[PDB]
Design a protein around this ligand. Structure first.
Ligand code: CLR
Ligand code: CLR
Ligand code: CLR
Ligand code: UJL
Lengths: 127, 338, 236, 57, 281
């Protein structure tokens, strides 16, 4: 069964640092593009960053580039999101979203209200 | 106090997977290692049915193994005579975006549906002598992806609504609703006795349902991506599923786990349709490659290829007597193979 | 058997009647151009449809410019997961993508960009051109003039963006408003060009959701799309 | 959020219902599938093509 | 010399075989594959049929006449062969002009192309292409005289050049020129010039936004036609005016260039395009 579980979170002072990790299982990790999405309190699911199958292509939402760094390591089937200089507005539940299909360049429904290939989510709070 | 439910669900999942692992004493490949290979299977295009203007999305055989309905997204629902290639009916649809077909076992009715979220039922044996809409089943909140008649008065449908439903066609009401899937339900297959049916959704899982009780009996979660096609093994104790994984898999209802996987390294495209042959030894699957591949259901060796379509193969069906295979495609032609 | 011959003859008469109807249906199916209207709930696509018209799973709008018939389809009661029911529209002439230049409430423009990326790079939509309606331009102008806008701190690359020489501002167009709107257009054009292998093109437009020119915009863009398809088909 | 609690309870109950079922070993299921396939081998035209005299197509 | 005559015979036979093989390939490929049954492909099919019939019914006897200045097939077959020559050459040029008009509608009226260039219009085009030249050629050769108005010098030419020879009077030469070459030729020239302009503008727009197939394609299309046909028709129309000064050997080489046109037509209109190759393979 496709399963994703995020790790990392908790309380961080403003300007602090945090490294989120996701343990992927049930599918060939190397074959899928992966994303990071977040749902701040009282708002919808937002897209943060994505990394292609090999890690050659990376993109960020404009509000976090220069702060967050997405990296995948296919050997251990884990996706990381280094995020430093956190600002109060970064308070949200962060989920890891998988691409719907392998060998594919588009990611259609990662931010949808209900998405099968998404993690449970880890709360990140900024004092 | 919510994390306790999550923990209990995780523990139940661990229990189920451990039980399945314990039951997996041997694999199907080991036990089938000693049987003779099927050998290369070649099929020629006996017929090529043309007349649809746009991509064909669904087709279904009649119980007589001679008449077959096909749905194309030009807004037409043509009933063919495969022996002669003569068109028997050509039903214009109110919504052009049909994506499913059904043929009543009695042959008196056909059904269809799609992005209109409606299952329309057409009476073929009218006294007026012309085909007219018998009933429009409304109540799904997402596109209709599959439908299958149980009788002349009952039909099971699946939807992007994420649910399947059973209808009383006479009253037009939804007898029961089958919920539990997380993504769009894409395919649907009735058991030979029509007491159970199996559905595959856009959540990489397949579920076994009870038509009359109305609950999920078992869930199968071998696949990695969206399930596009599902078919019952003729015995009724197993079913095959195809997905965007570029893989087909075989599940057994009694073992409650995957039995065999049908994939190849050079096949990296999704599977749009699956079907078995009469004996169940051949598994025929359509691909986005524009080709249909025949698989030895017991050996998992690709026993043949039905090349000949110049676009996506969208539908695939074997006659009730096993005499022929129909294959529709996005190139707007149906081909019959033997 | 005489009965078998009679049944065969009757089947042939029925078949030729069916095909006589099908030819008449084909003549009209080939003269019509099907359009997919796509967008967001907050984008003014519904208002555009309302202008063009002067529990359902899909809504159909019929209009004709000159003597050409256009059949535009708007998605109705469909869930927000589009990866399956969007393959149905791989043979429309164009997809009309409506975007609101925004400025619960979140950054709708980034999700519009991501949706446009998915549409552009989808396997089955690699031959379909997109008519991009950068909608709600008056709201963008008024919000940029007030000094409270989304772009500056949601798109940090904007702070170093300069209006292109090809820009054609209106006579009363404030320089900052044109800079903002052309930045938003270039955001979509980057995606459009990064994978435009010549099979499909993007046609950006600045619209206000109440325009009599949107019909002409779609007509001209469809004419261009089909002309380029024919030029490609004949090796130019 | 009551919807989350309801969904979790429903999922737990469904998992409980699916857990308590009789499962046979894969060996028996494979054996039965093979037996069915070989019992109807001759009745399968695609597997064993029929001569053109009886082929309706 | 025997070697010279044998080599020329082999060259003409090679041309004939190429014509027949290419055109028959085109005909069979269009007829068989069903996805290639668009009306434009039916214009190409009819053009291939005209070229194939030119290769079979006309080319071998012209080859015999060229290699040996006498005419061994009779005085009535002379008229039949001349009429078939004019008919099939004119029909080929007509098919070329109609293909040009079809492409003009595809490129300059894209939104109404499928409605306008339908199978009925294509059938009418094929009918005109096969019929107008047949009436013209056979009427001029049998039902009237291509040499009316020049009978004395016509009968001079009768013995000046031995065997079969296509004599044209000044009026007949001018009318045949205009009917067979200038009108359809000028139509397709204008059509392809406008198509070139449109394709050039589109390519320039696309390149400007992103940051010459039209030249190759249309240069081949028009260069083959011009080089193969323009010299022959020019000499034919001018010869009565120049009091038949042109030597016979020039006329022979020119008619064989005109035949090379039919040899190359399938290569220019069918084998040049990927959609035909794919189906062919
Ligand atoms: C001396 C004159 C009258 C001879 C005329 C012969 C003509 C009619 C012949 C010559 C070549 C022939 C074609 C050759 C091949 C095919 C392909 C086949 O799948 C359909 C018929 C078709 C298209 C033939 C039609 C008839 C045809 C055009
Ligand atoms: C289908 C294609 C190949 C055409 C088949 C029929 C062709 C070969 C026939 C039709 C008319 C025929 C010609 C009619 C008259 C004569 C004059 C005679 O003194 C020599 C033979 C010759 C020159 C014939 C040769 C063969 C011919 C050209
Ligand atoms: C003088 C003689 C040799 C001329 C021969 C030309 C023949 C082969 C040409 C002329 C018109 C042509 C037809 C024109 C249009 C159609 C309709 C289409 O749906 C099938 C092909 C068909 C039926 C063509 C077949 C070939 C055709 C019959
Ligand atoms: C290649 N031969 C063409 C033929 O030869 C005789 C005279 C004439 C007039 C138009 S075409 C033609």
């Amino acid at each position: 069964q496709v399963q994703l579980q995020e790790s990392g979170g908790g309380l961080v002072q403003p300007g602090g640092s945090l490294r989120l990790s996701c343990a992927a299982s049930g599918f060939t990790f190397s074959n899928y593009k992966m994303n990071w999405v977040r749902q701040a309190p009282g708002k919808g699911l937002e897209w943060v960053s994505d990394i292609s199958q090999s890690g050659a292509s990376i993109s960020y939402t404009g509000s976090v580039k220069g702060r967050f760094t997405i990296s995948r390591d296919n050997a251990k089937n884990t996706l990381y999101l280094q995020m430093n200089s956190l600002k109060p507005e970064d308070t949200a539940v962060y989920y890891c979203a998988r691409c719907p299909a392998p060998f594919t360049r588009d990611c259609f429904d990662v931010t949808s209200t209900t998405y099968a290939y998404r993690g449970q989510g880890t709360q990140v709070t900024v004092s | 106090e919510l994390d306790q439910l999550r923990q209990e669900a995780e523990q139940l999942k661990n229990q189920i997977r451990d039980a399945r692992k314990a039951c997996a004493d041997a694999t199907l490949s080991q036990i089938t290692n000693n049987i003779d290979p099927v050998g290369r299977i070649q099929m020629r295009t006996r017929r090529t049915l043309r007349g649809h203007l746009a991509k064909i999305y669904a087709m279904h055989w009649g119980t007589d193994s001679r008449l077959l309905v096909s749905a194309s997204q030009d807004g037409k629902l043509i009933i063919w005579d495969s022996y002669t290639t003569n068109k028997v009916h050509a039903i214009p649809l109110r919504s052009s975006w049909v994506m499913t077909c059904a043929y009543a076992p009695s042959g008196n009715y056909v059904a269809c549906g799609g992005l209109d979220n409606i299952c329309s039922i057409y009476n073929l044996k009218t006294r007026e002598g012309n085909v007219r809409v018998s009933r429009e089943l409304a109540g799904h909140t997402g596109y209709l992806s599959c439908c299958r008649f149980l009788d002349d008065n009952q039909i099971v449908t699946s939807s992007g609504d994420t649910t399947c439903a059973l209808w009383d066609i006479e009253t037009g009401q939804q007898t029961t609703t089958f919920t539990g899937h997380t993504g769009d339900v894409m395919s649907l297959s009735l058991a030979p006795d029509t007491r159970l049916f199996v559905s595959g959704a856009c959540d990489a899982s397949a579920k076994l349902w009870d038509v009359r009780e109305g609950m999920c009996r078992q869930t199968f979660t071998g696949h990695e991506s969206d399930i596009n096609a599902i078919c019952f093994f003729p015995n009724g104790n197993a079913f095959a599923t195809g997905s965007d994984d570029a893989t087909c898999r075989l599940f057994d209802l009694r073992a409650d786990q995957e039995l065999m996987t049908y994939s190849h390294d050079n096949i990296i495209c999704g599977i749009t349709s699956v079907s078995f042959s009469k004996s169940g030894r051949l598994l025929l699957a359509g691909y986005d490659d524009f080709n249909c591949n025949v698989w030895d259901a017991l050996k998992a060796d690709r026993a043949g290829v039905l090349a000949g379509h110049d676009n996506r193969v969208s539908c695939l069906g074997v006659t009730d007597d096993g005499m022929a295979v129909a294959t529709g495609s996005w190139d707007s032609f149906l081909k019959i193979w033997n | 058997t005489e009965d078998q011959r009679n049944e065969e003859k009757a089947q042939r008469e029925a078949n030729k009647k069916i095909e006589k109807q099908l030819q008449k249906d084909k003549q009209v199916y080939r003269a019509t151009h099907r359009l997919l209207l796509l967008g967001a709930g907050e984008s003014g696509k519904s208002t555009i449809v309302k202008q063009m018209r002067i529990t359902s799973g899909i809504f159909e709008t019929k209009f004709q410019v000159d003597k050409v018939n256009f059949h535009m389809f708007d998605v109705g009661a469909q869930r927000d997961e589009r990866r399956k029911w969007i393959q149905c529209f791989n043979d429309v002439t164009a997809i009309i993508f409506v975007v609101a230049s925004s400025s619960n409430q979140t950054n709708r423009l980034q999700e519009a960009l991501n949706l446009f990326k998915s549409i552009w790079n989808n396997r089955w939509l690699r031959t379909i051109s997109v008519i991009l309606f950068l909608n709600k331009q008056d709201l963008l102008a008024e919000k940029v003039l007030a000094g409270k806008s989304k772009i500056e701190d949601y798109f940090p690359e904007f702070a170093r963006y300069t209006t292109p020489e090809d820009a054609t501002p209106e006579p009363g167009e404030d320089p900052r408003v044109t800079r903002a709107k052309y930045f938003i257009r270039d955001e979509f054009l980057r995606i459009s060009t990064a994978s435009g292998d010549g099979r499909h093109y993007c046609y950006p437009h600045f619209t206000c959701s109440v325009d009599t020119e949107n019909i002409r915009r779609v007509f001209n863009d469809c004419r261009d799309i089909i002309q380029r398809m024919h030029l490609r088909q004949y090796e130019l | 959020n009551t919807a989350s609690i309801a969904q979790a309870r429903k999922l737990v109950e469904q998992l409980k219902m699916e857990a308590n079922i009789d499962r046979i070993k894969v060996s028996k299921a494979a054996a039965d599938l093979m037996a069915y396939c070989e019992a109807h081998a001759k009745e399968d035209p695609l597997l064993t093509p029929v001569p053109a005299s009886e082929n309706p197509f | 010399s025997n070697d010279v005559r044998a080599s020329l015979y082999s060259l003409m036979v090679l041309i004939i075989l190429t014509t027949l093989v290419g055109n028959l390939i085109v005909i069979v490929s269009i007829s068989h594959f069903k996805q290639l049954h668009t009306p434009t492909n039916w214009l190409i099919h009819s053009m291939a049929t005209v070229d194939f019939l030119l290769g079979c019914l006309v080319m071998p006897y012209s080859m015999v006449r060229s290699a040996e200045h006498c005419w061994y097939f009779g005085e009535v077959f002379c008229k039949i062969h001349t009429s078939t020559d004019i008919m099939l050459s004119s029909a080929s040029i007509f098919h070329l002009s109609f293909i040009s008009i079809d492409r003009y509608y595809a490129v300059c009226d894209p939104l109404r192309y499928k409605a306008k260039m339908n199978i009925l219009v294509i059938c009418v085009m094929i009918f005109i292409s096969w019929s107008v030249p047949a009436v013209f050629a056979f009427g001029m050769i049998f039902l009237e005289l291509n040499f009316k108005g020049a009978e004395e010098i016509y009968y001079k030419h009768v013995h000046c050049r031995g065997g079969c020879s296509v004599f044209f009077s000044k009026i007949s030469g001018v009318l045949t020129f205009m009917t067979s070459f200038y009108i359809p030729g000028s139509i397709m020239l204008c059509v392809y010039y406008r198509i070139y302009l449109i394709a050039k503008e589109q390519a320039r727009l696309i390149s400007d936004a992103n940051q010459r197939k039209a030249v190759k394609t249309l240069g081949i299309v028009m260069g083959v036609f011009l080089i193969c046909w323009c010299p022959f028709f020019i000499c034919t129309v001018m010869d009565p005016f120049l009091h038949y000064i042109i030597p016979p050997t020039l006329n022979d080489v020119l008619i064989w260039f005109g035949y090379l046109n039919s040899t190359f037509n399938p290569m220019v209109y069918a084998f040049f395009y990927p959609w035909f190759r794919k189906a062919l393979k």
